[PDB]
Ligand SMILES: COc1cccc(CN2C[C@@H](C(N)=O)CCC2=O)c1
């Protein structure tokens with residue numbers, strides 16, 4: 570679990586969104602595993618607007634943060650799960666690191682701010698859903 574709070578928005582993994590997120594829906598994209606809902610309280614986070622390929626992410630299954638080198642946002646094949654059929658997930662960035670299903674929502678940050686959230690994993694890999702292209706989050 571985990572979310573990004575920026576301005577009047579809350580960003581979560583689409584497969585983990587609550588009834589409240591869907592009742593206050595702003596935007597969702599099943600192909601990115603992202604959903605954005607509106608909030609009344611002002612958000613605590615800043616979004617990175619950069620091309621960084623190194624950063625640090627929170628791994629809840631280890632209660633630790635890990636430094637990672639990650640690929641550029643791209644279309645990657647993701648195996649079927651209880652939440653989606655087998656499909657290509659877009660705007661996904663891969664890195665070597667520990668991740669288990671419950672780790673989705675952990676934030677990945679660089680020196681400029683929030684880069685994305687954990688969305689995929691297994692086999693010593695961790696995938697992050699990028700949010701840096703969502704410029705409207707800042708307004
Ligand atoms: C860290 O996330 C992991 C780790 C191992 C396995 C998985 C598998 N999986 C893929 C997610 C997707 N973005 O399609 C949906 C939910 C899910 O359990 C995730």
Ligand SMILES: [Zn+2]
Pocket residue numbers: 617618619620621679680681682
């Ligand atoms: Zn950066």
